[PDB]
């Protein structure tokens, strides 16, 4: 249970704006003494899960996050081929070493210039017969004509070390380097991947998320429509480390049948069920065989679900209630309320959630599926696309209803530094050495609306 | 009664911003499985009533809304002759087939271009001796001089089907057509009306609201001044399906007298009374013979009524209370608190209101009485006019707000009222699937609500 | 006592934004059936008192308001000679007939054009040997040189009737007239004053506030510094109908002594005391001999007093508590919290105040002391000026807020204070019809209130 | 305990926006009759302590505030040499007479024009071999070339009176003077300092804060990192009148050890401890040997600490709780929530705090360490700078959040002007509750709670 200050007993449900964490006595020295590992069987070393939105979760996303301890859920109704290709792709990559943008000398500049923003490295590797011949920057593509081959503008001067080199060392070697990128080579000199000054420090801090075999973890999603038993079967055998059943209203007959369908197959994987804000719904979903319940519906007062239907629940209260009902049944809770700030993640955890799912916040990064554009003011933003009877399509569609990028820190690895830094500080304030202790030792209070006045 | 979460028991009354609906267990598959019919004796198949405001309710409003299942109340103190003409007109139209704008070749272009925005069809039908000779678009009237006859610019190429044709086919016939309008023809080849691709699907979903004789329903309103019995008599005998007695302050002797006056005549029509926010006022009006009580007074905290007198009530609590009082007396409540969002409609129904009266929200549509203008930014808006004894009027006008006529912005993408009704009914339908209700009574029985603070709006 | 809805019992004090009035059953036909008269011994026929601020209360203010039923308090520490001149000026004017701006033909245009906006009539009367020779409008001062004599531009065509003429006829005679002013003539043909079409209806509605002799009422203020008893005596013998002892903090030893000082003289006048928000202060002030207690301190959350000291009380709760303490001791309460809306006056009366003091709101009118200027956008505004050892003067000025004189915006449509009074009494009149009261005592007795949350303001 | 109106018992904790002070019966004539002295052993005659921020607290600051009765805490990890030089500098100055900007005839104009805004006097004193030869105004630096010697533009016409002259007289002499500055001369004619028309009135009002030796008081801060005993000893021996141990999270093991370390040395100075919002934390710090407890954490709802971690407490409710625990143990509480308004100081005192620490509010003043710049609109603002292991700088800095600037009020730009604004309000608060002093303010105060609707 979560403690509230004596006397604080609202006649209303609480949002993240309604509450505050009171610091207690703390024996925790520094943030680095905090274990952010999750016990929910997701195998994540940080309480961060990326949403099954098409705009957020691509190949590059799943890779980058898992390396740093998180996990990414792949969108439902995605072609099974594309899925299996992505799983094998990610599960095959290096734990400490990233995957740079590769360029053949035959490619154009417009290809080179557009591919540079697809990773946070700030440089592209030109590859010949599987060996690095040099690097490409935005500075190099500046004045060059769009259709010129990249062989002309390539800068062949860069730093190199063998794969498996001690990261502490790799940072010192990159110190005076004009480019922040270090190209990592296999024993035979072929390209392993790259590493940066900060990207090196990450390995020292973030523990990667791996499966039984030591491959980076990844997850995928499925709707309640069509054959649920079939899709879950296909997705599981494609190497998925976790499954997610997702729908708008998670407490409904079709969902309960769907969980039963997947539970019967006994795939031996953690199973996550759709969205509910109530304890009743949390029990009904776990009883149908879900291991983990994801919670949010209409969490914001002015959000589109709420303004349309009047339906929803304040997120703090919703997570607090559902997480408690889950612990009784020996299960866990995911917070699916949209999170734009680190305190959203910290509070979600303090309320008893084991993990927090992050949405379109992450669409504003290099690693998201969309292409990077620029507005009239030349500010960066990423843009993507959300794409059987002709008459029915119009009939169903009758009732049926980009994000800015931070120029300073544009990589998702930076957003995670921001998130984990805050959550680590939260733990030091309450005196917890980890997420289970956070839920135990946390003390909260209620504040009024008056504090938000100006 | 409506349930609230355990422990939520506020020291204040609640507005629509204070509450939220909590999803329960639901066996309802999709929105299409929900029955939006109302039991209050209004006969609407969707919980929407259009207000008796002069700006919103016209012939074109009454026709269009009733076809999709709502109903429109005509303004009070409207000329009795003018009423009957509107009544006979609406009752005479087609259930599945709309009414396009008609044009004789003798008419000017400036007339045709001003008539085009009076309906959502995007096309006008040119009629000769009661037969279609072609269509007119805004594209045709673009460069032609204002005073040219429309015979010159007419495009005689269009789509046609006999009246009574199965709508599913009609959608297919319009599939690749450059114009979204299909002209429907009578047995003798005369013009029945039109249908559009989207307009076809509506008939598939929305059930029209009809009377005993199978004619579209329409309603009218009456003031408490003068002879209420006579006005009510006349309107009733003019073909009105429902009556509305309307005044600012619904709880007062003159209103109770007005209702009895209408009730004694026993016109056998549903009777609705003026406006009240309390259980006492709701009982008093039903005892006077009102069938249905309309509720809102000064609903908004910053609205003109509240800022003027300090008087009003938060609408959710008002609806809850008044609706519970009506059920005991075996009667119903219409929510007249202004609705700008679907969730306003959803919550009113969840609070126990049988039907929801929709206000100036519908003034921003093609089908409303006003002419469509354009501002300095070339954004569309509709504008109408709110137009007495011997200079005594000046004495009375001194305390009167003296508010001149106003205009409302129009949504360019979806500018027809039928689009707004898609928006409204969609949300209400999702509300029901969220609570697990298959219909409006079930929404009221099974709904669970909770209270949130103001901090969530920060 | 004030009734609240069952269950509304907040853990906090209330502002006017916290509450709403619930309409009850009402037998009151129209607004005109409401008696706005006050029982506190002020003698006002409307619940409005104009503040003793230098920007607001001048000769023209005192005249215009008293005519329409209010009373104006003259600033404290005003020279006693100047006071007596103003009192005699006001008590000497006509009850039904206003006082026009007067012009001698010798006067310049710059004087004439600047004098025109000092009254709401929109025209000035040109006087020769005490007889009207014509009128001057703003249209007349347009092209004429600033220094030309006004004899050149005068329009000698206007409407005239004898003083004492029935107002109803005067409106009919002015019906088609190009100028809204009718010149009233004495028996000897000399100028008595003027009247307008609207100014005529006011007399039909507003009951003037008069003393025993039938003279318009007026009041004055006095500070707590120096000799209080002496200052009060002077003011009383100068013809002041009411006295006001005024200070920032009304609850302190020095304020109690001042009241004892004025009460001991037994001048037989209603006595008003400075400002407190508490029951305790309201007793102490009445016990010290105050007839009426004025209440507000730091009403606004963000106002300068609140932001400087952290001190104050939410006005609704302050008036309710203080009015309760006043009644028990057989006295009345003035609401001194700043009012920008009709509802502020209404909610104040409902809370139990006998009269409501209106502040700088009225400074934005023609009839206020300031000169009328215009900004870069040519929008009208009024501006006024707030004008012992220098070492101590510098010493006292050190902690002083040191706020220079301020100006207020003017509503172009209705700019005369009489128009603000129409706005206010209209709202207060409607509040009464909603609650079912025929008058202010009944308002306080029969009113029902409720509490609302902050969420409604989102 | 503090009284709240009957019926006010919120289900939530309160910020300053939540509460109001109710006026009681008052025997207090005028504001001047109110005694703002503090009993906490700080030795301040006004309840104002300047925060230990690098942007706020300089030499000039420590001097100006102590003279008017407050005290300034010097930043931690400041070089011990610089500290003693600053301490010896401040403790050496004059009680009634300020320290003007001094100029040698050899200094350039670009130096003089930049040196003029470092003090609020509006004039610089040109000094020759320790004697005044004249003054420099902004009007003098207008047309002169930046590199021309200042000997050329000097105005030798000014007002002079002996040091020790009665301030009222000094005010009259300055009455018709074109310059508001009066140069005060020592017995030998050398420059003692200056005094202005308003600065004179201040001496009549504000009582200076001094130590046993009659020297202006000053304080310093220390972190919990490294050797705490060592730093504290040196700072004490450097002439520091009061010590403050400061950290983000005040309730933790490392802090308790740090306080015990400084308490064991028995330096006989008032001791202040880092930041906590709870009664438990207030006791644990006092029990560890802290004399005074500083309280605030994440006081604002939208402030970075709260938006980052979700941690904090509404300040009013926090101070009330902590001060209650401190009074029981015979100790005191400082209000460390950042204050932008006089009402913040008054209410903090109403809550039982003996002193109120003022933050970056005072960085926007002439006397703060930064240089005074001007923006595109030519509006004044002050700007300063917040400047071991090579691998750790990258590792530790990963989780770490640059120097900031504050706008300056053109009307009132000196901190003494801010002190007039602040003490004016706090004084009225006391006259409103009827208290003649801060102990009486806490005793006699009545409060109430308001809703958010009032801010609409």
The CB density around residue B210, as the number of other CB atoms within 10 Å, is 18
Smallest CA-to-CA distance from C45 within C68, C74, C72 is with C68
Q: What is the DSSP string of C55-93?
A: TT--HHHHHHHHHTT-EEEEPTT--HHHHHHHHHHHHTS
The CB density around residue B111, as the number of other CB atoms within 10 Å, is 15
Apex D50 CA angle, D46 and D53, nearest 5: 175
Q: What are phi and psi of D246, to 5 degrees?
A: -125, 135
Q: How far apart are alpha carbons C66 and C44 in whole angstroms?
A: 8
Smallest CA-to-CA distance from C221 within C275, C257, C172, C169 is with C275
Q: How far apart are alpha carbons D138 and D142 in whole angstroms?
A: 6
Helix (H, G, I), strand (E, B) or coil at A399: helix
Across D233-269, b (16+ Cβ under 10 Å) vs e yields eebbebbbbbbbbbbbbbbbebbbebbebbeeeebeb
Q: Which long-range contacts (CB under 8 A, 24 or more apart) does A392-396 make?
A: A394/B171, A394/B197, A394/B198, A394/B201, A395/B201, A395/B204, A395/B205
B438 to chain A, any CB pair closer than 8 A? The answer is: no
The CB density around residue B371, as the number of other CB atoms within 10 Å, is 13
Apex A221 CA angle, A215 and A223, nearest 5: 165
Q: What are phi and psi of B317, to 5 degrees?
A: -55, -40
Q: What are phi and psi of B203, to 5 degrees?
A: -55, -30
Farthest-apart Cα atoms in chain C, separation: 72
Helix (H, G, I), strand (E, B) or coil at D196: strand
Q: How far apart are alpha carbons A87 and A216 in whole angstroms?
A: 9
B98 CB burial (10 A radius; 0-12, 13-18, 19+): buried
CB contact under 8 A, B308 and C426: yes
Q: How far apart are alpha carbons D384 and B317 in whole angstroms?
A: 56
B415 to chain C, any CB pair closer than 8 A? The answer is: no
Smallest CA-to-CA distance from C137 within C154, C160, C157 is with C154
Asked if C370 and C363 touch (Cβ cutoff 8 Å), the reply is yes
D195 to chain C, any CB pair closer than 8 A? The answer is: no
Q: How far apart are alpha carbons D77 and D220 in whole angstroms?
A: 10
Non-local (6+) Cβ contacts of B389 within 8 A are none
Using only C-alpha atoms, chain B has a radius of gyration, in whole angstroms, of 23
Q: What are phi and psi of A183, to 5 degrees?
A: -85, 120
CA distances (Å), C279 to each of A363, C275, C323, C325, C326, in order?
Answer: 60, 12, 8, 6, 8
Q: How far apart are alpha carbons B171 and B67 in whole angstroms?
A: 18
Q: How far apart are alpha carbons D314 and D162 in whole angstroms?
A: 52
CA distance A103 to chain C (A): 53
Name the residue in chain D with its Cα closest to that of C317: D450
Among C454, C456, C457, pick the best mutation site for testing chain A contact (most A Cβ within 10 A): C454
Apex B428 CA angle, B423 and B429, nearest 5: 95
Q: How far apart are alpha carbons B282 and B318 in whole angstroms?
A: 10
CB contact under 8 A, C301 and A453: yes
CA distances (Å), A299 to each of A90, A310, B340, D311, in order?
Answer: 33, 11, 21, 21
Helix (H, G, I), strand (E, B) or coil at A419: helix
CA distance C109 to chain B (A): 34
Q: Per DSSP, what are the bridge partners of residue A102?
A: A125
Helix (H, G, I), strand (E, B) or coil at B101: strand
CA distances (Å), D134 to each of D126, D127, D144, D186, in order?
Answer: 5, 8, 17, 16
Q: Per DSSP, what are the bridge partners of residue C244?
A: C221, C272
The 3-class SS string of D332-346 reads: EEEECCCCCCHHHHH
Q: How far apart are alpha carbons C406 and C383 in whole angstroms?
A: 6
Q: How far apart are alpha carbons C303 and A269 in whole angstroms?
A: 61
B393 CB burial (10 A radius; 0-12, 13-18, 19+): exposed
Q: What is the DSSP string of D414-437?
A: SHHHHHHHHHHHHHHHHHHHT-SB
CB contact under 8 A, C301 and A449: no
3-state helix, strand, coil in chain C (%, to 5): 35, 20, 45
To one decimal, the resolution in angstroms is: 2.8
The CB density around residue D294, as the number of other CB atoms within 10 Å, is 26
Active-site residue flag, C141: no
Q: Are strands D3-4 and B407-409 parallel, antiparallel or unpaired?
A: unpaired
DSSP H stretches of helix in B92-180: 109-115, 167-173
Helix (H, G, I), strand (E, B) or coil at D67: helix
Asked if C183 and B380 touch (Cβ cutoff 8 Å), the reply is no
Say how far residue C47 (Cα) sits from the centre of its chain: 10
Q: What are phi and psi of B84, to 5 degrees?
A: -60, -35
Non-local (6+) Cβ contacts of A118 within 8 A are A60, A101, A366, A372
CB contact under 8 A, A21 and D310: yes
Against chain C, the chains showing at least 3 CB pairs within 8 Å are A, B, D
Contacts A–D by Cβ distance under 8 A? 148
Residue C247 is given by DSSP the state: -
CB contact under 8 A, B12 and C8: yes
CA distances (Å), A66 to each of A209, A434, B232, C345, in order?
Answer: 5, 20, 74, 65
Instruction: Closest CB to D309: pick one of A5, A17, A422.
Output: A422
Q: How far apart are alpha carbons C244 and C221 in whole angstroms?
A: 5
A167 CB burial (10 A radius; 0-12, 13-18, 19+): middle
Smallest CA-to-CA distance from D88 within D213, D259, D187, D173 is with D213
Q: How far apart are alpha carbons B433 and B14 in whole angstroms?
A: 24
B453 to chain A, any CB pair closer than 8 A? The answer is: yes
Instruction: Closest CB to C10: pick one of B11, B13, B281.
Output: B11
Asked if C287 and C329 touch (Cβ cutoff 8 Å), the reply is yes
Asked if B72 and B367 touch (Cβ cutoff 8 Å), the reply is no
Asked if C229 and C216 touch (Cβ cutoff 8 Å), the reply is no
Residue B216 is given by DSSP the state: B
Q: Are strands A443-446 and A19-22 parallel, antiparallel or unpaired?
A: antiparallel
CB contact under 8 A, C314 and D29: no
D211 CB burial (10 A radius; 0-12, 13-18, 19+): middle
Asked if C48 and C422 touch (Cβ cutoff 8 Å), the reply is no
Farthest-apart Cα atoms in chain B, separation: 73
Phi-psi domain of D7 (left: phi exceeds 0; alpha: psi -120 through 50; beta: other) = left
Q: What is the DSSP string of A73-107?
A: EEPTT--HHHHHHHHHHHHTS-SSSB-PEEE-TTS
Contact list, B454 vs chain D (CB under 8 Å): 452
Instruction: Go through the domains of chain D in sequence order and give each one's CATH number.
Output: 3-94+208-387+402-455 (3.20.20.70), 101-201 (3.10.580.10)
Q: How far apart are alpha carbons A6 and A277 in whole angstroms?
A: 26
Can you give the length of chain A in residues?
Answer: 454
Q: Which residues of A are catalytic?
A: 303
Farthest-apart Cα atoms in chain A, separation: 73
The CB density around residue A81, as the number of other CB atoms within 10 Å, is 9
Non-local (6+) Cβ contacts of D454 within 8 A are C15, C17, C18, C300, C301, C314
Cα end-to-end span (Å), chain D? 32
Instruction: Closest CB to A298: pick one of B16, B20, B171.
Output: B20
Q: How far apart are alpha carbons C432 and C32 in whole angstroms?
A: 11
CA distances (Å), A190 to each of A124, A193, A194, C239, in order?
Answer: 16, 9, 12, 107
Apex C302 CA angle, C301 and C306, nearest 5: 70
Instruction: Closest CB to A343: pick one of D11, D14, D310.
Output: D310
Q: What is the DSSP string of A200-253?
A: HHHHHHPPPPB-TTSPBP-EEEE-SSS-HHHHHHHHHHTT-SEEEE--SS-SBH
A369 to chain B, any CB pair closer than 8 A? The answer is: no
Name the residue in chain C with its Cα closest to that of B401: C423
Smallest CA-to-CA distance from C134 within C116, C122, C151 is with C151
Interface list for B 291-350 with A (CB within 8 A): 341-343, 346-347, 350
CA distances (Å), B413 to each of A332, A400, B381, C93, in order?
Answer: 44, 15, 13, 64
Name the residue in chain C with its Cα closest to that of D21: C311
Non-local (6+) Cβ contacts of C203 within 8 A are C95, C96, C167
Q: How far apart are alpha carbons B455 and A17 in whole angstroms?
A: 6
Asked if D67 and D95 touch (Cβ cutoff 8 Å), the reply is yes
Non-local (6+) Cβ contacts of A251 within 8 A are A276, A278, A280, A281, A284, A285, B23, B24, B25, B26
Provide the strand spans (E) within A6-65: 19-22, 48-50
The CB density around residue D92, as the number of other CB atoms within 10 Å, is 10
Q: Which long-range contacts (CB under 8 A, 24 or more apart) does A258-263 make?
A: A258/A224, A258/A228, A259/A285, A259/A288, A259/A289, A259/A290, A260/A288, A260/A289, A261/A228, A261/A229, A261/A232, A262/A222, A262/A228, A262/A229, A262/A232, A262/A289, A263/A288, A263/A289, A263/A290
Q: How far apart are alpha carbons A421 and D191 in whole angstroms?
A: 55
Q: What are phi and psi of D68, to 5 degrees?
A: -95, 5
Across B231-256, b (16+ Cβ under 10 Å) vs e yields bbebbbebbbbbbbbbbbbbbbebbb
Cα end-to-end span (Å), chain C? 32
**Helix axis angle, A390-399 relative to B417-435, nearest 10°?**
80
Q: How far apart are alpha carbons D148 and D144 in whole angstroms?
A: 7
CA distances (Å), D303 to each of A451, B141, C388, D249, D277, in order?
Answer: 11, 59, 47, 16, 16
Helix (H, G, I), strand (E, B) or coil at C334: strand
Smallest CA-to-CA distance from C447 within C353, C317, C347 is with C347
Q: Are strands D131-136 and D159-162 parallel, antiparallel or unpaired?
A: unpaired
Asked if D298 and A20 touch (Cβ cutoff 8 Å), the reply is yes
Q: How far apart are alpha carbons B101 and B104 in whole angstroms?
A: 10
Across C91-128, b (16+ Cβ under 10 Å) vs e yields bebbebbbbbbebeeebbbeebbeebbbbbbbbbbbbe
Against chain B, the chains showing at least 3 CB pairs within 8 Å are A, C, D
Contact list, B277 vs chain C (CB under 8 Å): 22-23
């Amino acid at each position: 249970m979560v403690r509230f200050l004596d006397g604080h007993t609202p006649a209303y449900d609480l949002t993240y704006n309604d509450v505050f964490v009171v610091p207690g006595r703390s024996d925790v020295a520094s943030r680095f003494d905090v274990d952010l590992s999750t016990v929910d069987g997701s195998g994540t070393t940080i309480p961060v899960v990326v949403a099954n939105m098409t705009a957020v979760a691509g190949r590059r996303m799943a890779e980058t996050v898992a390396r740093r301890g998180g996990i990414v859920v792949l969108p439902q109704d995605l072609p099974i081929t594309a899925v299996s290709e992505t799983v094998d792709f990610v599960k095959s990559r290096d734990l400490v070493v990233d995957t740079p943008v590769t360029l053949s000398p035959e490619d154009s500049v417009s290809d080179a210039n557009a591919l540079l923003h697809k990773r946070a490295h700030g440089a592209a590797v030109v590859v010949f017969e599987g060996r690095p011949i040099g690097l490409v920057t935005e500075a190099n593509c500046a004045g060059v004509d769009r259709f010129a081959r990249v062989r002309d503008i390539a800068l062949s001067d860069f730093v190199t070390a063998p794969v498996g080199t001690d990261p502490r060392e790799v940072f010192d070697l990159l110190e005076h380097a004009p480019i922040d990128v270090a190209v990592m080579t296999a024993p035979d000199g072929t390209l392993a991947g790259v590493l940066t000054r900060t990207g090196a420090i990450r390995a020292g801090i973030y523990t990667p998320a791996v499966d039984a075999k030591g491959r980076l973890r990844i997850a995928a999603a499925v709707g309640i429509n069509g054959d649920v038993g079939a899709k879950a079967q296909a997705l599981a055998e494609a190497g998925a480390d976790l499954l997610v059943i997702d729908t708008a209203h998670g407490h409904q007959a079709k969902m309960l049948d769907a969980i039963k369908a997947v539970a019967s197959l006994d795939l031996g994987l953690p199973l996550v069920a759709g969205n509910v804000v109530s304890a009743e719904g949390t029990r009904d979903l776990i009883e149908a065989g879900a291991s983990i319940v994801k919670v949010g519906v209409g969490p914001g007062a002015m959000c589109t679900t709420r303004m349309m239907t009047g339906v929803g629940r304040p997120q703090f209260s919703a997570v607090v209630e559902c997480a408690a009902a889950a612990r009784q049944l020996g299960g866990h809770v995911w917070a699916d309320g949209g999170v734009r700030h680190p305190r959203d993640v910290a509070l979600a955890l303090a309320a008893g959630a084991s993990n927090v799912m992050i949405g379109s916040w992450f669409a504003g990064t290099y690693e998201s599926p969309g292409d990077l554009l620029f507005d009239r003011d030349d500010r960066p933003y990423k843009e993507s696309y959300g794409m059987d009877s002709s008459f029915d399509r119009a009939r169903k569609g009758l009732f049926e209803e980009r994000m800015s990028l931070d120029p300073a820190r544009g990589g998702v690895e930076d957003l995670l530094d921001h998130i984990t830094s805050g959550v680590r500080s939260t733990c030091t304030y309450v005196g917890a050495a980890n997420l289970p202790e956070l839920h135990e030792k946390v003390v909260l209070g209620v504040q009024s609306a008056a504090g938000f006045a100006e």
